Amino acid sequence: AKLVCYFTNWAQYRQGEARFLPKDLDPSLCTHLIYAFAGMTNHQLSTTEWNDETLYQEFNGLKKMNPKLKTLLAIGGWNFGTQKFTDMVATANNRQTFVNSAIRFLRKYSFDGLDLDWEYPGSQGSPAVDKERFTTLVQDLANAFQQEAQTSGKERLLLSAAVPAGQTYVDAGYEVDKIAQNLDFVNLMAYDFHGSWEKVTGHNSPLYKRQEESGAAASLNVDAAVQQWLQKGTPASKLILGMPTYGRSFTLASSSDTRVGAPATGSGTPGPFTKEGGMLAYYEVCSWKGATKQRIQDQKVPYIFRDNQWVGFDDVESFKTKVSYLKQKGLGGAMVWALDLDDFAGFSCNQGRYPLIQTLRQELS
Ligand SMILES: CC(=O)N[C@@H]1[C@@H](O)[C@H](O[C@@H]2O[C@H](CO)[C@@H](O)[C@H](O)[C@H]2NC(C)=O)[C@@H](CO)O[C@H]1O
Numbered sequence: 001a002k003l004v005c006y007f008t009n010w011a012q013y014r015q016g017e018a019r020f021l022p023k024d025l026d027p028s029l030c031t032h033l034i035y036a037f038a039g040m041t042n043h044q045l046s047t048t049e050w051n052d053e054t055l056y057q058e059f060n061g062l063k064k065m066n067p068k069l070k071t072l073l074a075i076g077g078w079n080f081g082t083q084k085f086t087d088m089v090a091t092a093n094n095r096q097t098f099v100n101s102a103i104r105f106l107r108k109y110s111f112d113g114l115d116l117d118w119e120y121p122g123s124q125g126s127p128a129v130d131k132e133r134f135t136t137l138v139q140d141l142a143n144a145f146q147q148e149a150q151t152s153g154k155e156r157l158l159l160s161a162a163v164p165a166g167q168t169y170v171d172a173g174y175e176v177d178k179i180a181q182n183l184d185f186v187n188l189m190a191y192d193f194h195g196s197w198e199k200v201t202g203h204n205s206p207l208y209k210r211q212e213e214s215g216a217a218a219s220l221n222v223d224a225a226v227q228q229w230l231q232k233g234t235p236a237s238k239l240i241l242g243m244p245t246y247g248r249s250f251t252l253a254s255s256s257d258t259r260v261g262a263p264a265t266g267s268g269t270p271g272p273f274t275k276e277g278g279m280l281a282y283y284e285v286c287s288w289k290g291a292t293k294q295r296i297q298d299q300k301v302p303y304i305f306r307d308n309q310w311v312g313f314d315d316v317e318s319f320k321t322k323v324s325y326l327k328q329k330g331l332g333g334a335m336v337w338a339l340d341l342d343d344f345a346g347f348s349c350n351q352g353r354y355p356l357i358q359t360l361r362q363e364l365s
Helices: 052-064 083-090 092-109 130-152 167-173 222-233 316-329 355-364
Strands: 002-008 032-040 070-077 113-118 158-163 185-188 239-244 246-252 264-267 279-281 294-296 301-306 309-312 333-337
Touching: 002 185, 002 239, 002 355, 032 052, 032 083, 032 113, 052 070, 052 092, 070 092, 070 158, 083 092, 083 130, 092 113, 092 130, 113 130, 130 158, 130 167, 167 222, 185 222, 222 239, 222 316, 239 316, 301 316, 316 333, 316 355, 333 355
Parallel strands: 002 032, 002 333, 032 070, 070 113, 113 158, 158 185, 185 239, 239 333
Antiparallel strands: 246 264, 246 279, 246 309, 294 301, 301 309
């Protein structure tokens, strides 16, 4: 099976021990390492950090310690927006500029493939035509990669994309049917289903729906998302179940009511290391003294709370489960976001190195 794990640029800036660099990457923990992120400048693939070139060298260097390992460069993300994307795909001449810069950029730093993270084709201010163009981008990259390998005699570069679990976004700009055939594999980011952007407490990545929960909110869970993509026409072998190594927090209305789906005034206060409201890294979560861990029967997932803070995350057991669901449905493997967010150096969870992801590696084989 495949174990796809994301590495992020900005992790290098975390203070204290939370600092993450390639040096902290275990070359054997995952089957595929993905670098987040790479930008675009003049329809061309280009770095985004002052020391990306040195990092690209380290990241891909791991392959000397494990030749079986595969690395891919990811372009986009949430903050990337859609402007630069929609532009690049509008005209075949700018599109071809990209396809070519891709092939050169990747071959220059030793990347085995490229991960497309357009969020999202035909959404967030993206013409409903981009849905079609995205397919064209996928097909173009696909052909170029197929051609290049034949004339260069090197291992064909890989092409994957990070797709959404959001019913809307899905039907909004993804020709599942078609793209699924030009992508080596599909990373379903089955997380962020619920968040501080809802005035009522919810869980980040829920496996199934709550017994007392329906309507459109019945789609907001892993299973639903997973069954969706499979039906739309994605062979399961090419479907990678993404899993979060972070959780989502809410500042409760009153420490009196902590019912999953309780009134929340807003996002949980920010963590000491990640420093972002409504978001907590696993290693920060398990740092809660006198917390109150709990589980959601319906949707096999925990969540702790202390006073007015309520954070829904995944722990070792919730990962064991999901890996199990994964296998059950016959999926191609698991995908994890993100490396730097697990307790990568066992400095606060008291569970060793990469607690969450190691559980994945174990169960997967
Ligand atoms: C492929 C993927 O997971 N894409 C999304 C991620 O980019 C996103 O991570 C968030 O990225 C922002 C910049 O792109 C960061 O500022 C932000 O801190 C970071 N948040 C987290 C929790 O890593 C994740 C998270 O929601 O969602 C993906 O859809």
